């Protein structure tokens, strides 16, 4: 209903936190998925649900990981929709 | 109303807290019932109502224990329904 970190509601505000992002997952994709770096290794948190993720592996999709681990996120729901979240969890017909 | 620990709303998020679970009661059943391990023996807590449970006995049913001890849980209500909860308490 309300974002945990409103100051990170904007794409650019989140993107800049990945200044010298050297890890395997693309920082633009992470930022688009609602994540921002907390300045501790590859640790990131969603601006909306506050869910944190770490130990990113190559080829991982930030949106898919967001939906897998934090299906209750309202930002995820508003941007991707029920169908996308259900498919990730295969929860469907 | 709002879950005590929203970061534990997802099944997988709860299941992973059991990665080193060596107790009799099955971790998948515990996670499905809304519980996640807190890292203290076999102590678990519900992501929604915050109700904590410990000292599990073999063959115990997580859902049944959830309903017995925390009948007021909204997660329990939405998933199992009022009838299930009443039956557990023989009402």
């Amino acid at each position: 209903n309300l974002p945990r970190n409103p100051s990170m509601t904007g794409y650019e505000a989140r993107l800049i936190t990945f200044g010298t992002w050297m890890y395997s997952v693309n920082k633009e994709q992470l930022a688009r998925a609602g994540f921002y770096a907390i300045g501790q290794e590859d640790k990131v948190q969603c601006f909306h649900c506050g869910g944190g993720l770490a130990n990113w592996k190559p080829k991982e999709d930030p949106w898919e990981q967001h939906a897998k681990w934090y299906p209750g996120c309202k930002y995820l729901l508003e941007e991707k929709g029920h169908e996308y979240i259900n498919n990730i969890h295969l929860t469907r017909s | 109303n709002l879950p005590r620990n929203p970061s534990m709303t997802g099944y997988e998020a709860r299941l992973i807290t059991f990665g080193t679970w060596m107790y009799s009661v099955n971790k998948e059943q515990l996670a499905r019932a809304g519980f996640y391990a807190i890292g203290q023996e076999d102590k678990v807590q519900c992501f929604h109502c915050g109700g904590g449970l410990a000292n599990w006995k073999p063959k115990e049913d997580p859902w049944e224990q959830h309903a017995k001890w925390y009948p007021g849980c909204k997660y329990l209500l939405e998933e199992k329904g009022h009838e299930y909860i009443n039956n557990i308490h023989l009402t």
Partner: peptide, 4 residues
Amino acid sequence: AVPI
């Protein structure tokens, strides 16, 4: 990946 994994949750914090």
